[PDB]
Write a protein that binds this ligand. Structure first.
Ligand SMILES: Nc1ccn([C@@H]2O[C@H](COP(=O)(O)O)[C@@H](O)[C@H]2O)c(=O)n1
Length: 388
């Protein structure tokens, strides 16, 4: 065979993980890699060293048909090591299945490494609490069998079906929150089913890395000396974290931008409801997909040190540059933080949230309550804050 390592993600969290996997094999310049993100994401000085590296667009949660043309370039017997996100694994897999129908003997699936996309997986699991999980796993296993035979996507429980890959392939899951699987009693049958097949997305796996490997990795993820020097001061530090919306609508985007700026003021102004105190130097860590919402903050915010938005927050934890306090909109990043470092986590909702009972039905709120990352007395949605 040749091994083809296929990394189908572009989103911040799974890609951060997959880039570490790549870094661990980076001295091997010959092995074929396919990445589901732009060729311009990584430094060209690095990528041009790899003689069998390709970049494919992910669209509607599937690699495009370019993936067929790439694989057509490899006439040998191939074993595919797939790396993909859990929430979208079914869709991401579809073209690989389609291609394998054409080359069933020559192309085999050697392994899957499955990673949380983010919090979507958790908020989706929250909606399954009253379902019969034992039988959902069974039904999904049968329905995965049919998907592999027919290529057609049909799952009674698309959320639980994300977790049955082991019935067909060697698999390892990388979870944002292993604790969630321990603390959610309704998931005990899944926890049991998955025993020994998962690990936490840990980020100490960056210490396992050699010193030169660590340097390489920072280059891949866009972390430089200049970023490091943003943290040179001894002064205690507060990072305001931003968020985003999958929504081109200008009114929705300008809404986000203005709400976010206002939220920042409630943390940084002595008149604010969340005032953190004068001791802290203030930083901004914009959402990587935040776009013009990030510009708006940088345009209008006084007295703030920007941490470039493309730098994933967790890189701060790996490199030992975490601040003293962090606050902002609910994000996957908070799952990485020790509790004492959290100032306030703030929520958003399309429904007007009018009171505490409305709040407790929000699935994101439920996840964070289940994990004890917030308590019920303090739950804040950002539209409840006054314009400052
Ligand atoms: N303000 C932010 C928000 C998200 N992120 C990155 O994007 C990932 C997904 O975050 P959300 O769940 O907020 O979309 C986080 O785990 C983090 O890697 C960031 O670096 N800075």
């Amino acid at each position: 065979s040749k091994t083809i390592t296929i990394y189908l993600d572009h989103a911040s969290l799974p890609t951060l993980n997959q880039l570490m996997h790549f870094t661990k094999e980076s001295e091997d310049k010959e092995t074929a890699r396919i990445f589901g993100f732009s060729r311009f994401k990584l430094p060209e000085k690095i990528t041009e060293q790899y003689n069998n590296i390709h970049f494919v667009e992910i669209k509607n949660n599937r690699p495009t048909e370019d993936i067929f043309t790439i694989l057509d370039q490899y006439p040998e017997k191939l074993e595919l090591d797939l790396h993909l996100n859990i929430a979208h694994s079914i869709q991401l897999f579809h073209p690989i299945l389609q291609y394998r129908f054409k080359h069933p003997d020559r192309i085999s699936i050697k392994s899957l490494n499955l990673y949380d996309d983010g919090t979507a997986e958790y908020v989706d699991l929250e909606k399954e609490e009253n379902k019969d999980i034992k039988s959902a796993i069974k039904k999904a296993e049968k329905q995965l069998s049919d998907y592999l035979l027919t290529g057609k996507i049909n799952f009674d429980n698309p959320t639980l079906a994300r977790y049955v890959w082991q019935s067909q392939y060697p698999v390892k899951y990388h979870f944002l929150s292993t604790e969630y699987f321990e603390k959610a009693e309704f998931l005990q049958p899944l926890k049991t089913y998955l025993a020994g097949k998962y690990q936490k997305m840990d980020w100490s796996a960056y210490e396992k890395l050699s010193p030169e490997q660590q340097t390489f990795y920072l280059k891949l993820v866009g972390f430089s000396d200049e970023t490091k020097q943003l943290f040179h001061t001894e002064q205690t530090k507060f990072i305001f974290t931003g968020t985003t919306t999958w929504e081109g609508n200008t009114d929705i985007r300008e809404y986000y931008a203005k709400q976010q700026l206002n939220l920042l003021k409630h943390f940084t102004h002595s008149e604010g409801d969340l005032f953190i105190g004068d001791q802290y130097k203030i930083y901004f860590k914009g959402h990587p997909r935040g776009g013009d919402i990030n510009d708006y903050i940088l345009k209008h915010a006084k007295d703030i040190t920007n941490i470039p938005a493309n730098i994933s927050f967790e890189i701060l934890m790996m490199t030992g540059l975490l601040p003293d306090k962090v606050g902002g909109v609910a994000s996957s990043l908070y799952f990485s933080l020790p509790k004492e470092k959290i100032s306030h986590i703030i929520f958003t909702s399309n429904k007007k949230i009018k009171n505490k009972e409305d709040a407790l039905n929000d699935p994101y709120v439920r996840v964070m309550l289940r994990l004890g990352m917030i308590d019920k007395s303090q739950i804040i949605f950002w539209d409840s804050l006054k314009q400052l």
